């Protein structure tokens, strides 16, 4: 149990760029802590964060009882860069899983900055991966009225997948030991570097890459309840949702904070609690 003592029982990493995504990142962290008594450590992709966020994180850590660490990893010069900040951030989620964390960490979970956690994240740590270096929840099929927007159900993806699930990259558990054993980081970087020579390829960089590689870098398909997003998932399955992603709805184009307040009743509770912690530190 070197990993649990040197780090924590639950290790979550996330990426956030912008005050809005940093405001949601604090909410995500509070939601994790309200649903677990296991030790938690949050790991942040440091260079995207504002100076205010990095100043506030020790206050969140002391109030909620978690450890944290800033990871500053530099994009290798050989590896095809991303001009768009959104795509650069996606690259940080999926391309460096073997080099961002210390070798003494055996497991890490990516949880999106805009997520609301309603479960003990140690259940994901304990989830059997059957030898897969990582596990992702599938994209919901349950909201039948959104079938026209499920690009992965027809065209190039339906032919490529051969019936395999097209997984959502909002949440994923990485068994770092197995990822290292399989050199999945080196292989993901190489396939990304070859694929990205075509600027039309990997439209959803962080999502398309592990879905493309799932025949050779296995994905343990997580239970559907691990990731619920209103765009693709039915209202009836929300009560089972372990975590919620505020994923974009191509039909309604509803703003981010509106989706948060409308779908998640405890969202303002976390937002106000974190704002109350900020006014308590300020005075
Ligand atoms: C984190 O740890 C706390 C403290 O152990 C957990 O709270 C405890 O949860 C149990 C299970 O619900 C409670 O026991 C039961 O409580 C009900 C309601 O009073 C009572 O009718 C039953 O007879 C039984 O005693 C326990 O009271 C409660 N303790 C406190 C201080 O709230 C909490 O559930 C843990 N959270 C996680 C995510 O593990
Ligand atoms: O830190 C961030 C993240 C996103 N955005 C912007 O927000 C917009 C929409 O992105 P986002 O809110 O991330 O969309 P989601 O639908 O929530 O993203 C889903 O789909 C992405 C891949 O397409 C995955 O990376 C996510 O985990 C998954 O939730 C874009 O302009 C992003 O550049 C930011 O400004 N800052
Ligand atoms: O490795 C791949 C990369 C990109 C795409 C297409 N993208 C552009 C439109 O949105 C979906 C993702 C693929 C489609 C099918 C199979 N493999 C793919
Ligand atoms: Ca999201």
Numbering used by the authors: 1191 to 1473
What do the authors report?
For example, the envelope glycoproteins of many viruses are exquisitely dependent on calnexin-mediated folding, a process enabled by the action of the ER endoplasmic reticulum enzyme UDP–Glc glycoprotein glucosyltransferase (UGGT) and the ER alpha glucosidases I and II. ER alpha glucosidases I and II usher client proteins in and out of the calnexin cycle, which is part of the glycoprotein folding quality control in the ER, whilst UGGT plays a key role in retaining misfolded glycoproteins in the ER for a “second chance” at folding correctly. We could not crystallise the GT24 catalytic domain of human UGGT—so we used crystals of the GT24 catalytic domain of CtUGGT (hereinafter CtUGGT GT24) instead. The sequence of this fungal UGGT has about 70% similarity and 60% identity to the ones of the same domain of the two human UGGT isoforms (UGGT1 and UGGT2) so that any ligands found with the crystals of CtUGGT would likely bind the human enzymes too—paving the way to a medicinal chemistry program towards modulators of human UGGT activity.
In the course of an X-ray crystallography FBLD effort aimed at the discovery of molecules binding the catalytic domain of Chaetomium thermophilum UGGT (CtUGGT GT24), we encountered crystal polymorphism: the majority of CtUGGT GT24  crystals belonged to space group H3, but some crystals lowered their symmetry to an equivalent P1 pseudo-rhombohedral lattice. The best hit was a CtUGGT GT24  2.2 Å  H3 crystal soaked in 5M-8OH-Q. The molecule is bound to a conserved patch on the surface of the protein. Diffraction data from this crystal process in H3 with Rmeas H3 = 0.323 and in P1 with Rmeas P1 = 0.206. The CCP4-Dimple/REFMAC5 Rfrees are Rfree H3 = 0.227 and Rfree P1 = 0.2537. The compound binds to a conserved patch on the surface of the CtUGGT GT24  domain, about 15 Å  away from the UDP–Glc binding site. The morpholine ring is partially disordered in the crystal, but one of its ring placements is 4.2 Å  from the conserved 1396DQD1398 motif coordinating the Glc ring of UDP–Glc; the ligand also causes a displacement of the side chain of CtUGGT GT24  1346Y. Through this displacement, the 8OH-quinoline ring inserts and is sandwiched between the aromatic side chains of the conserved residues 1346YW1347—which we propose to call the “YW clamp. The two aromatic side chains stabilise the quinoline ring, forming an aromatic trimer; the 8-OH group of the quinoline also establishes an H-bond to the side chain of 1402H. The compound is now the starting point for a medicinal chemistry programme that will develop more potent and selective UGGT inhibitors.
